[PDB]
Design a binder for this molecule. Structure first.
Ligand SMILES: O=C(CNCCO)NCCO
Length: 478
């Protein structure tokens, strides 16, 4: 009691925001640190965070933030030098996964402890939306310098509602209420535990047996029956989520656009999404999630056409194509989808060999390239297409969501669209990016879907906002 347990799937890897692009981390330390700006619960606008106000230069190059009075968890104050230190290591640290979107930072300096001044190399409208991401969580410069970044990442001094009280790697992360948080008065919970439970049904049974207060990732097959269960509440929260089939373009004949186009034409999207998501998903046709900024509703959907897929593969030397399909065991959708894709690809002479793995282990296999195809997903945590575009199409250190997709026109277009000042031309550039990615088959878009989570009836205000952030500060456990 007083502690909210949350069953999750993938487990924490770090509390240093620059070192992870995964929700197993960002959804956890989003309630551990605070940010200069925040996004409201409906994901529509920016709101004050650690910064109570801000002003932008006329030349759009100087961003000045007025910090409110706030403390870190260790009692020390939150100063503009702390924020300056945080922004700049995203740009400059060797281990940062986000150097590319933050390469446009000329300087960040504190003119005085309350005032932060960031100047960019060129204007970029996304910069303010960027400051709401948990990636720009404000860390304590003094203590990072004191402890070093390796120890800080395992027991941080935090600026948000909770501290990391203990961390059993691969098992659970136990957060304790931070009494120095500037909104600590609003925080009812004494603590939060993220418990990794990699089997969907086991996670659900644990909620229903009162072994967990809440869980994320309700398996689609059970949403309907659980909605009728009086002891629990299914949440279906508006999201920026999209699921997709990754393709490793480095792996032989998968480099040929025709082979990837053939795979796209051999997978019946409507049938797949209806069967595997039990009607909860919406067929996806663009890498930008439907409802998010610049989403292009008339992007190409290749109709199911196995005859043309067979000819494309034959013309390309890939008639007998065999694929290493990495599958996350215990992820019901992942498993169901793999059976459908395997069955459908077999109709065009393609053999998908399923390799079932621990869901906590597959991401590293994507990074290392030890896969031909594998389903994964993405959620935005800012209100701008530049974050997903850079990770998925930017040709940055992440290798285009680990596909190794390469298109020189796209790489340049991503950088141009970032700094485009004309909003009407910026929109057209993100439309062309959705078009070009689809022409090339960077990956196979599968479906959009809400966040579907579950909580026992006594838990109040267990909302995940569209940017993935759980309103753990508003939660009341009755
Ligand atoms: O969706 C993401 C990151 N989402 C937060 C935006 O950076 N990663 C793949 C799933 O872990």
């Amino acid at each position: 009691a007083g502690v909210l347990t949350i069953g999750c799937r993938e487990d924490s890897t770090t509390f240093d925001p620059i070192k992870s692009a995964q929700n197993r981390d960002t959804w956890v330390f989003a309630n551990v640190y605070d940010t200069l700006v925040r996004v409201d619960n409906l994901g529509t606008k920016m709101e004050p965070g650690l910064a109570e106000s801000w002003d932008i230069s006329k030349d759009g190059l100087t961003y000045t933030f007025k910090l409110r009075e706030a403390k870190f968890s260790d009692g020390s104050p939150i100063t503009a030098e702390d924020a300056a230190f945080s922004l700049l290591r995203i740009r400059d640290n060797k281990a940062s996964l986000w150097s590319d979107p933050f390469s446009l930072i000329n300087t960040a300096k504190a003119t005085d402890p309350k005032t932060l001044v960031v100047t960019l190399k060129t204007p970029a409208v996304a910069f303010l939306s960027q400051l709401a991401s948990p990636t720009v969580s404000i860390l304590s410069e003094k203590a990072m310098t004191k402890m070093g970044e390796d120890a800080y990442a395992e027991n941080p001094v935090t600026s948000g509602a909770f501290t990391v009280d203990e961390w059993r790697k691969g098992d659970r992360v136990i957060l304790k209420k931070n009494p120095n948080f500037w909104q600590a008065k609003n925080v009812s919970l004494d603590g939060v535990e993220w418990v990794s439970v990699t089997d969907d049904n086991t996670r659900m049974r644990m909620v229903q047996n009162n072994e967990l207060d809440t869980a994320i990732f309700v398996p689609f097959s059970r949403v309907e029956e659980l909605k009728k269960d009086k002891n629990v509440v299914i949440h279906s929260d508006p999201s920026t989520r999209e699921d997709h089939l990754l393709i490793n373009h480095e792996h032989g004949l998968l480099a040929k656009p025709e082979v990837r186009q053939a795979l796209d034409m051999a997978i019946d999207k409507q049938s797949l999404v209806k069967t595997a998501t039990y009607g909860q998903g919406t067929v996806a046709y663009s890498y930008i999630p439907k409802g998010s900024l610049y989403h292009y509703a008339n992007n190409l959907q290749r109709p199911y056409d196995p005859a043309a897929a067979k000819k494309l593969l034959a013309d390309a030397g890939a008639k007998d194509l065999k694929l290493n399909y990495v599958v996350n065991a215990g992820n019901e959708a992942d498993e169901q989808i793999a059976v459908i894709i395997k069955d459908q690809l077999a109709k065009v002479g393609v053999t998908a060999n399923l390799q079932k793995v621990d869901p906590t282990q597959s991401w590293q296999m994507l990074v290392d390239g030890t896969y031909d195809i594998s389903v994964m997903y993405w959620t935005n945590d800012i209100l701008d297409p530049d974050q997903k575009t850079t990770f998925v199409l930017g040709h940055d250190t992440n290798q285009n969501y680990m596909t190794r997709y390469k298109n020189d026109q796209v790489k340049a277009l991503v950088a141009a669209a970032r700094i485009e000042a004309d909003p009407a031309k910026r929109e057209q550039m993100y439309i062309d990016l959705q078009k070009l990615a689809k022409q090339d088959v960077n990956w196979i878009d599968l479906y959009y879907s809400p966040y579907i989570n579950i909580s026992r009836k006594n838990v109040s205000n267990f909302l995940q906002n569209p940017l993935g952030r759980f309103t753990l500060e508003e939660v009341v456990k009755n």
